[PDB]
Structures are given as structure tokens and as C-alpha cells.
């Protein structure tokens, strides 16, 4: 037993991470088939970042201005193009370690694994969640842009995220693998507000079920609630509203524990109104909302 | 920036995880060169677990009683032997994905990455620490025995742990890759007490430096302490004693922040005596002790 924040095995993704250097900037790229994907602001100087015309900047770039490197292998760029915010660098060599993959755009509240890399070399792996305000709380230093987020579906690598920027809060923002940013953000160095962040309610309940599965039951109360009355408490504490879909998703967790979703919501109502009173849940003194119901079921079966 | 619990890339280890089935038991094995390493109690029935004579049990086993499987490949066992608590199954095929590796026995307080597997297939990756009482807090279901812990040193995979058992506490215990158990534990299903667990003090200080690097400074006080006076507070709260070696190890973190180790210990003294008063440090309402000074420096450079 035991419950830990767990990331997918990164082996299939490590063989796709390359180094991309354009002039003075070095970051990471994703090498699938014969294209290297990377954030388009690799072509920007520190001055260009303030107000870039990416179409004009890319025009002044030739193929030889991009030094792509996969370990010791050096990949020829035979062309370059732009897909909304990502630079697609066509190379003369197909990646022999290219896995079976898809490009997916995940929903707020869903989780994924990030393979943090620096100068094209993988550094570490950790699990993240797409916050309701379309940011993520990760660990990205200078040189980590281009690192990708992914899920492993059956026998398929589903790329969902590529890191671009850091927020004044300390949270991070990026795009899908088609270059479309998650959230209202644009790749320009200017003031941009992230939305008020809320707590993923269905994730908290899935995490409370994980605690019940692992023996932690002190928060279970013998009261129940309604979807309306709970959602009144939820919006007071900036918890995102619970729907009947969320109840159905938690079905496998409620069936395993024999505790209905509306029963668990009464326990969560008490925890929000009274706090934890000095106790812990799964070794945490705070409510955790970065485990999807799938993540919990994945770690219990 | 940002600070997250991070595990090493698992690609080099995934290509070594195989399935080991002996009679009715299925668990994981480690396929290096031409040997498969796995916990020796794979040969035990549920009845043998209570009081096993592993020498007598292994004698009744032939080579054909071990079904080893690497995905679809089926590996011939051409011999079997015992190295203290691990079964070494010699196979007729050398693993072509064998990386450069060593077998190391880590110290209490050090961390490593666990590649959790089930039926020989990798499931997830997460970071763990060898507690002072030689247990670990991981996520191991039925079928996870045989999963290994490892560090990646420069260009070398240092295997340090193989999972064997679960404790009544919910914590886990295992051996090094030479079959020697961490802690006083034996591979027998009988009452065995783990030692009183203590908090890794040098790890807490490294985690407090990480918070200072990432902007969290509310706990810094303008007092300092001595190594003696702090160790008096440390033993009261079951914190393991701080030595001059621990001070020297934190050198890179104290130099980056300009905050001496004895200064940070006065902040930790206040946090233990007064609690957190409702605030958080790096998004946690509890003191974290599973980040080594190396882990923090690794995530900041
Ligand atoms: C990344 O490309 C990288 O790893 N580069 C390698 C070469 C070193 C790099 C990583 C930076 C954080 C470690 N990313 C960037 O350089 C991006 C691109 C330029 C600016 N940043 C960036 O991360 C900015 N953040 C930023 O500008 N964020 C905002 C504006 S803001 O922070 O509110 C402020 C007004 C500037 C204070 C704009 C984007 C949306 C969020 C807010 C920092 C370098 C300041 C962290 C691009 C094009 C965004
Ligand atoms: C592992 O081999 C596996 O994944 N097997 C696959 C086939 C399903 C398996 C995992 C069990 C937890 C998920 N490990 C074991 O079967 C080991 C071996 C037998 C018993 N256990 C084991 O984990 C025991 N734990 C246990 O006996 N622990 C103690 C004794 S105790 O828990 O205090 C008690 C007195 C029994 C209550 C002995 C070892 C040291 C710690 C205490 C449980 C199955 C009960 C979890 C071996 C040889 C230890």
C-alpha cells in the first residue's frame, strides 16, 4: 500500500529530448520523426522579448542559425516553420527512438508528468496538474524551456504540455504541442495576470478516498449533504463546483470504500470550516488537489 | 524556479525490469547482463512465509520452476543461486539494454528514486528517502516486490534498494542489490519492530534553504544558536543530532543565500517550539525532511 505522488516512466520521452541553440539562447526541443519542436522565443534576444514580431524575427533566420544536438549526434535543420508559438525545425534524420505518440490538449484539473531537462539532457521527472487558471506549479530553471508534459495511455505517449514561461507568482505556463497557450497568456515579456486560482474539488475527494483506502479515516463524519448545499460552501472557499459528472467519475472510489460521494462531501465541508485541528491526512496538514480520480485508482489497482 | 520532489529519469532502469513467476507467486526482477535479481521469497507459498527455511525450499526448486519474462521475450534460466536474501537467476540471454551500473548501499538520510513495477511492467516513478530507522515511505501494492531504487551518478546507474515487505505502520523495507536488508528486518512473516523514527535534521535545513532561494523567508529570525544548544532542542522533538559535517555539507546552500547554518538552526528551533502558526513553507504546512542538500543544490543549479 502507501500513496505517493507518482510520475509516469520517462524512458520513451528521454530518447526524444534534444538541445536547441539559436544564437545566444539554449533550451530544449522535442525530436519526433524528423521535426524538432521548441518554443518559438528561442530566436529572440533579451531585447526582442519585450515586444517581439515573431514573423519578422523568424524571417531574418536561416537554417544554419539553429544548432540542434542530441547528445553527440548533430541534426541538420533542412527547414523551419512556426505553429502558433512553437518552432518546427525539420531535420534530415528521423529519430530512431520515436515512440508511438499523440498530441492532446488536456483539461483544467487533469494531471501529467513533466520530464524536466536542461541543455537537452533530462534532469528529473515529477507529476503536475493543470490548474483551473491554466498554470502549473513545477520546477523550471533557466534552460528548462522546451521540457514537455505527457501521459502514457495504454501503449501511447500523449504529449500535452511544453514549458515556455514563469509567472510572477512562481507558477509556470506553456502551450500544447500545437503551439496554443494554456490560458490567456502570450509569449511576450509584459504584465499578464493569471486568473484567481481555485481548488480542484473532485481531486480533493479522490485524495480523501485514497486516505480512507490507506487507513486514514478520522475525518469521516456521520453526516451527508446535497450537491447544492455543498457547492455553497465550495464557492466560499474558492473550491470549483461539483457536478453529477464528478460524482459518476468517483464511482470506482466510492464503490471500493462503500462511502458515497455526498457523504465524503460532508467530511470535506467540515474540514474546510474547522480546519484539520493539528492532524494530518496521508502525511499532509493541507488538503491536496493534484490527484485525479484516475491517479488514485491507478495507484490502488 | 520552483521546488518539487523530483525523481531521476527512469529510462535506463525500465529496460531491465522483468517478470518473475515461481509457482503461484508473481513479482518483479532486475535483469542485468545475464542475471535476474529478485527477492528470494518468490519461492515461498503463503504457508512458507511464516517460518521459511530458504535453503530447503530452494533445493526443491529446479530451473523450470522459474518463468522469467521481459515483455514478450522469454528468458531461459540456466541456473539459480541465493545471495543472502535475493535470488540470482542466471539466464541464457544477456540483456542488450544493460546500462553502466554499480551496486551501492546507501546511508540513512540519503534519497533515491523508485521505479514501481507490477508484473514486470513499470508503473511509475517517485523519490524516497532511507529513514533513520531504515524504512521508506513509498507506494507498493501486491506485485510491486522486486522494484528497485536507484541513483544516477554522472553516467552510472547506482542501484541501492530492492523492495521486499510492508511494515504494520504502512512503511516499507527491503535490501540492497547484494541481498542485505536495511534495518534489523528478516524476510519472515512474524512480528518485527522498526526503530523509533527520527527527523533528518540536515535535510530539513536544506529544505529551508530551498524555501529561502524560492522567496519564502517569513521563518528567518534574527537570532542564532550553537551546535550544542540546538541539539538539545533536536532530541526533544526526535530530531537526529547536527554535526560539523552536516554544517560543511550545507556550505553551498549557506553560501548562495548568505545565511549561516547556525542562523538557520535558530529559525528551525522557533518552528519546532512554536509551530507554523497557520502559514506554509514551499506549499507545505509541515517540515519536510526528504530532500538532501544534494537534492536541493541539484534543483537550484
Ligand atoms: C526559457 O525559455 C528558458 O529556459 N530559457 C533558457 C535560456 C535560459 C525561459 C525561462 C525563464 C524562467 C526560468 N523563458 C523565458 O525567457 C520567457 C520568455 C520571455 C520571458 N520569459 C519568462 O519566463 C519571464 N516571465 C514573464 O515575462 N512572464 C510574464 C510577465 S511578468 O512576469 O508578469 C513581468 C511583467 C515580466 C514581471 C509574461 C508571460 C506570461 C506570464 C507573465 C521571466 C524571465 C521574467 C521569468 C517570454 C517570451 C515569455
Ligand atoms: C511482495 O513479495 C509482492 O509484491 N508479492 C506479489 C505476489 C503479490 C509482497 C508484498 C506485500 C505487500 C503488498 N511481500 C511479501 O509478501 C512479504 C514477504 C512475506 C510477508 N510480506 C509482507 O510484505 C507482509 N509484511 C510482514 O510480514 N511484515 C513484518 C511482520 S508484521 O507486518 O509486523 C505482522 C506481524 C505480520 C503483522 C515482517 C517483515 C518485517 C516487517 C514486519 C505483509 C503481506 C503482511 C504486508 C515476507 C517474507 C516478509
UniProtKB/Swiss-Prot annotation, chains A, B:
Q: Which residues form the Peptidase C30 domain?
A: 1-301
Result after altering residue 205 to V:
In strain: Zeta/P.2
Taxonomically, the superkingdom here is Viruses
Active site residues per record: 41, 145
Q: How is its activity regulated?
A: Inhibited by pyridone-containing alpha-ketoamides compounds 13a and 13b. In turn, alpha-ketoamide 13b (tert-butyl (1-((S)-1-(((S)-4-(benzylamino)-3,4-dioxo-1-((S)-2-oxopyrrolidin-3-yl)butan-2-yl)amino)-3-cyclopropyl-1-oxopropan-2-yl)-2-oxo-1,2-dihydropyridin-3-yl)carbamate) inhibits SARS-CoV-2 replication in human lung cells. Inhibited ex vivo by michael acceptor inhibitor N3. Inhibited ex vivo by compound 11a and 11b.
**Residue numbers on the Cytoplasmic membrane side:** 1-301
Q: What is the effect of changing residue 189 to A?
A: Does not affect ability to cleave and inactivate human TRMT1
Q: Enter cross-link residues for Glycyl lysine isopeptide (Lys-Gly) (interchain with G-Cter in ubiquitin).
A: 5, 90
Where is the protein localized?
Host cytoplasm; Host Golgi apparatus; Host nucleus
- Outcome of mutating residue 90 to R, per the record? In strain: Beta/B.1.351
Q: Describe the reaction catalysed, as an equation.
A: TSAVLQ-|-SGFRK-NH2 and SGVTFQ-|-GKFKK the two peptides corresponding to the two self-cleavage sites of the SARS 3C-like proteinase are the two most reactive peptide substrates. The enzyme exhibits a strong preference for substrates containing Gln at P1 position and Leu at P2 position
- Known consequence of changing residue 132 to H? In strain: Omicron/BA.1, Omicron/BA.2, Omicron/BA.2.12.1, Omicron/BA.2.75, Omicron/BA.4, Omicron/BA.5, Omicron/BQ.1.1, Omicron/XBB.1.5, Omicron/EG.5.1
Function, in words = Cleaves the C-terminus of replicase polyprotein at 11 sites. Recognizes substrates containing the core sequence [ILMVF]-Q-|-[SGACN]. Cleaves and inactivates human TRMT1, preventing tRNA guanine(26)-dimethylation of tRNAs. May cleave human NLRP1 in lung epithelial cells, thereby activating the NLRP1 inflammasome pathway. May cleave human GSDMD, triggering alternative GSDME-mediated epithelial cell death upon activation of the NLRP1 inflammasome, which may enhance the release interleukins 1B, 6, 16 and 18. Also able to bind an ADP-ribose-1''-phosphate (ADRP).
Tell me, how does this one assemble?
3CL-PRO exists as monomer and homodimer. Only the homodimer shows catalytic activity. Interacts with host FBXO22; this interaction promotes the proteasomal degradation of nsp5.
Q: Write down what this protein is called.
A: 3C-like proteinase nsp5
Q: Which residues of the full protein are shown?
A: 3264 to 3564 of 4405
